[PDB]
Structure formats: structure tokens, C-alpha cells
């Protein structure tokens, strides 16, 4: 009932619209040269991380 109440109020729609408004500054992340190596140093999995 409650999540449909925020629907009939339109609060989920405000949530979604705020999503794309916030999207107006988020730079594209740099994903590293060897994107698997990027994520690997990210999770710390290669030797020494």
C-alpha cells in the first residue's frame, strides 16, 4: 500500500527524475588501460595489492 501510495503521489517519479538531473555532472569513470588489470588492482587481487 505504501509504495503504491508514493506512486499515486508521484514520489518514485521524483526519485527517477532526480536521477537524471544528478547525472548532469558525473564524469565517465576512467577504466584503466587493461580493464581487467584495472579491476584487478581494484579488488587488490594481483600479487602485492
Amino acid at each position: 500500500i505504501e509504495e503504491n501510495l508514493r506512486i499515486v503521489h508521484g514520489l518514485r517519479e521524483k526519485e527517477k527524475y532526480d536521477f537524471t538531473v544528478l547525472q548532469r555532472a558525473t564524469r565517465i569513470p576512467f577504466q584503466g588501460y587493461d580493464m581487467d588489470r584495472f579491476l584487478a588492482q581494484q579488488k587488490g587481487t594481483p600479487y602485492g595489492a
Binding site: 558525473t26 569513470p29 577504466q31 587493461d34
Partner: peptide, 20 residues
Amino acid sequence: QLQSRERLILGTHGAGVVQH
């Protein structure tokens, strides 16, 4: 030849430009 395309262009929902 986009790298890690099978997770980025194919399976990353927002095409890798959108941060969820």
C-alpha cells in the same frame, strides 16, 4: 574494439556512461 565489451556494452546496463 571496445575492451571488456561483454560486461560494458553488452551487460553494463547504462552503456558505461551512466553511474547508478
